[PDB]
């Protein structure tokens, strides 16, 4: 017994307190951070990312994350890539009916179903058909750390 001290060997629910729907961008960043134990609240993330209440852009999000030492990259991946090496909590850009733009946190994509954590919703799982309809493109992939595998 005690072969390996698995850090966070259990899945938990990150209870992020929502304020406004524009906070969604900061709430996403918060969700991933707190998921790995990093105490970064969407409130503090809002002032960190320079959250614009008319257009919270991914440009500010990624830079502020990296200011925390939390490495992030803004990449473009297609639906086919979702079935490749997608195993990240990630801030993806979705636009509903070309009207309302929000960020959703991707957890994993399996059986053509994309498991997302929408800051405005609970835990919703969209099929490729549903997801690609609103998801134009744009994923801010987040690194849980640099050499965080070590201890």
């Amino acid at each position: 017994s005690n072969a390996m001290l698995r850090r966070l060997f259990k899945k938990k629910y990150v209870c992020v307190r929502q304020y406004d729907l524009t906070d969604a961008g900061a709430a996403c960043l918060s969700s991933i951070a707190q998921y790995y134990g990093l105490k970064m609240s969407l409130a503090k993330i809002r002032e960190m990312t320079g959250t614009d209440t008319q257009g919270t852009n991914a440009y500010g999000l990624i830079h502020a994350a990296k200011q925390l030492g939390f490495s992030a990259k803004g990449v473009k991946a297609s639906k086919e890539d979702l079935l490749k090496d997608f195993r990240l909590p990630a801030i993806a850009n979705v636009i509903v009916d070309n009207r309302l733009a929000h960020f959703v946190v991707i957890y994993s994509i399996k059986n053509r179903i994309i498991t997302v954590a929408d800051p405005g919703k609970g835990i919703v799982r969209y099929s490729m058909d549903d997801f690609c309809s609103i998801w134009t493109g744009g994923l801010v992939l987040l690194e849980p750390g640099e050499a965080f595998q070590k201890g």
């Binding site: 729907l21 524009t22 906070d23 969604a24 961008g25 996403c28 959250t51 614009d52 209440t53 008319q54 257009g55 919270t56 852009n57 991914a58 440009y59 999000l61 990624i62 990259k73 803004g74 990449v75 473009k76 991946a77 890539d81 490749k84 090496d85 195993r87 990240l88 801030i91 850009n93 636009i95 070309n98 009207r99 309302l100 733009a101 929000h102 960020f103 744009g138 801010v140 992939l141 690194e143």
Partner: peptide, 24 residues
């Protein structure tokens, strides 16, 4: 994770999570 390289800033400026499109 390394999926690829990051794109131009304009792509990130285009990406938004609290914005509204089709302004009309």
């Amino acid at each position: 994770l390394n999926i690829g390289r990051e794109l131009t800033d304009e792509e990130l400026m285009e990406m938004t999570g609290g914005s509204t499109f089709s302004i009309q």
